[model samples]
Target: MYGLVNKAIQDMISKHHGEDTWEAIKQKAGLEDIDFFVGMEAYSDDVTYHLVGAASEVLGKPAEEWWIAFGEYWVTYTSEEGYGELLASAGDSLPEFMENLDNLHARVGLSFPQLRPPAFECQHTSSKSMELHYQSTRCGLAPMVLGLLHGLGKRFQTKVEVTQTAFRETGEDHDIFSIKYED
Candidate 1:
């Protein structure tokens, strides 16, 4: 993962919790220096998991919830960091955005070679619902996908209820998200 992801974790913690809280979480994560995270530099994915785990312990929240929260935060974070228009150009509506997700990842990958993003495909079940198929080499981020959906939903002001319809671990090549939403 890139340091930008780690940076967002720090920013999300610091913005919601205090700086002292961020520091404590850092220490709990066994990270000597969270400041060492550079936006373009790649780091071990363990660093992120550790931070989220430490945050879970310190905040008494589930790691899944934290992942989802970070997903929501990521949208706001990236947009504010000058990717707003780029994200806007991906799609106008939530479904449209979901459709263009692969293109978005391809665009980002052009900028950062170390970023191995997951692949996504979407199919609409109806005007009020859709299914997002997610495949990644990474593991244990199913909750994060759920979080990402919530984040994108919030981004478009579209109320969405997301349920895991298929599991990557359960004889499926990818995870499936069944989304029910309305404006």
Candidate 2:
């Protein structure tokens, strides 16, 4: 992952919990020596995992919950971090954005050479529903996809309900989401 990710974690924590809590989380994650993160730099994925673990302990929330919350935060974080225009270019509606996610990732890859983004496939079932296929090179982030959908729903001002129909961790081929949305 890039430093921007870690930086977003810090920013989200500080914004919601306060600087003291953020500092405590860093300390609990055994990262006290790192004063700040450089946005373009790459760091070990372990750093993020450790931070999430420490955040779970510090905040008394499960790692899955934090992942979901962070996923929602990521939507706002990226927009505020100067990716708003890029995101806007992706689409105007929820389905449009969902379908363009892979293109969005490809465009973003220009900035972070090491980006290992998840892949998405959208199958529109109707004007108000779709089956979303998500495949990733990583694990334990299926919950985050739920959050991302909610975030996009909010972004597009659509009412949305998402149900996971398949699970990657449970030995399914890939994660699949049954999504219903209305503007």
Candidate 3:
């Protein structure tokens, strides 16, 4: 992971919970020694996982829910933090963005080799439905897919419904999501 990610977690918590709460979360994660996360700097992935786990504990929410919320915040966060043009160039709609997701990650990775962005493949199952395939080296983020889809729906002003058709928890090789969306 990169410090950019940790910074986003900080921004997310601060936006919703207040500055003191975010500071408390940082303290809980035992990351109080770090004053600021340099957006372009590399950091341990474990640090991020610990922060998330600590966040869930302090907020009294499920780990999956925290991941979901983080996923939802990510797009907006990146856009506001100097990736607006890149985001605009990525795609115009949710389906378009989903289709080009892997490509976008690959392109973005050109600059940040430390970012191990997940792979995504989207296959249209129907006029209003699509199947999304996700593969990653990370764990426990499958539910973040649902949150990302919902965020994309809001971005495109579309109605979105999603179901987990395949699970990493079920001993599958990867996760698959069945998404039904409407304009």
Candidate 4:
């Protein structure tokens, strides 16, 4: 699955951004050919905090329990665009990165087996905007994460509130759906 997904992503990058940029990434990573590499970074501590919270909910563990574990598991899988920048700027190798991720996982008191499944998808809506959608089988922390965003906004004293939107899954399943923070 990882190989296929990586190849498809490489193909997309070549098709859209030209093969040169893809090659550049390969060369920068000291690879002879394009392999699996996606660059993402976490620009702010707030974003990292939210990410940790989200992972906790997905893993069906308390936030504190899963925070570090979540980071460890995702550091490799995370898009190179988010928190990855911090690692890259520090000139860390994959092993170093993995170690740091594992340490973080341990700090949060999460074991590898305790992780939860995540049902989140992200799509780019425009050049400057994007949308993230998540659904969860575990209902407990899902709502809490939404509420945490609201509380964080209040703490920051910003008008950046997450508005809830309700909808119904109209297929034969008829799963009633409710979303928070629809753009």
Candidate 5:
């Protein structure tokens, strides 16, 4: 993962929990020596994992639960942090945005060649329903996708319902989400 990710984690925590709590989590994660994360730099994936783990301990919440919130926060964070134009160009509606997610990430890839962004494929089942296939190199982020979808729903002012149809952890080919949106 990139430092932007870790930085977002910090921003999410600091914004929601306060700076002192974030500092406590950082110290608990044994990352107190690092003052800040550079947005474009590469970092050990374990750094994020450790932070999540430490956050769970410090906040008394499960990791997956917080990850969902982090995913939602990511949408807002990126939009405010200069990626708003790119996101706006991706789509005007929730469905459009869902479909263009890959292209959006690909555009991001141009600037960060090492980015291991997740891949998404939307199979529209009806005017307001779709099956979303998610493939990623990273594990344990399926919940984050749920949060991301919910965030997008809020962004587009659409009512969204999503359910996991398949689980990668259970040895399925990939994760699949059944999504329904209402304008």
Candidate 6:
């Protein structure tokens, strides 16, 4: 999962800022384990740890505080000059996706009602169409969406779906993509 996620992130950075920027972020994030010169196959593991930790601190606050910080982080990270530049070019919207990530971290913190199971279901919209839905109750939706978009865009040719409703209240159902072709 780390390798897959990291590769997707790297791809997004490379696309917007060029490969050099991606390489620099990786190094700055202390990912020397991933071979910079080779096929990009080393795993830092620490970067993931740091992200998890930061998320924990952010989510540990009360709902009001969390919401404020959440919005602030979103604004900071997804602005034109923010990480969203690379992220958007890679087909992801900023801050809006942050909920997905926050939810994921909250779940890890043993915060009940935040953890989400990974599953997809097909809801029949009509005889001719069925909507495929992916559900999550966690806050990490943004990161997850960004990761999925960057990672699977080429191979699967699909778009990431983000619902406007809150995950907890709405049960977080989203249709990331529809299957148009099958082997």
Prediction 2 global C-alpha lDDT: 0.92
> Candidate 2 has which clashing residue pairs, if any?
none
Q: What lDDT tens digits, residue by residue, belong to model 4 across residues 21-132? A: 6565344434444344332211223333443354344334566443333333333333342434544443333222222433443432242333333343434443322244
Q: By TM-score, is 1 or 6 better?
A: 1
Alpha carbon lDDT of each predicted model: 0.89, 0.92, 0.87, 0.37, 0.93, 0.40
lDDT of 1: 0.89
User: How does each model score on TM-score?
Assistant: 0.94, 0.97, 0.96, 0.27, 0.98, 0.36
Candidate 6 residue spans exceeding 4 A from truth: 36-117, 127-133, 136-139, 146-162, 168-183
For candidate 6, report its TM-score. Answer: 0.36
Model 4, stretches more than 4 Å misplaced? 1-110, 127-129, 140-142, 151-159, 166-183
Tens digit of lDDT per residue, candidate 3, span 1-183?
A: 888888999999999999988888888998999999998889988889889988998999998999899988987888899888888887888888888888888888999987789999888988788998999998888877787788788888999998888988778989998888888
Per-prediction backbone clash count: 0, 0, 0, 17, 0, 15
lDDT at position 67, candidate 6: 31
User: Which 10 successive residues of model 6 have the least lDDT summed?
Assistant: 90-99
10 residues in a row with least lDDT, candidate 4: 172-181
Q: Candidate 4 overall Cα lDDT vs. reference?
A: 0.37
Best first by lDDT, ranked: 5, 2, 1, 3, 6, 4
User: For all the candidates, what are their Cα RMSDs to the real structure?
Assistant: 1.3, 1.0, 1.1, 19.3, 0.8, 13.3
Q: Which tens-of-lDDT digit does each residue in 15-81 have in candidate 5? A: 8899999999999999999989999999999999999999999999999998899888889989998
Error of 1 at 11 (Å): 0.4
lDDT of 6: 0.40
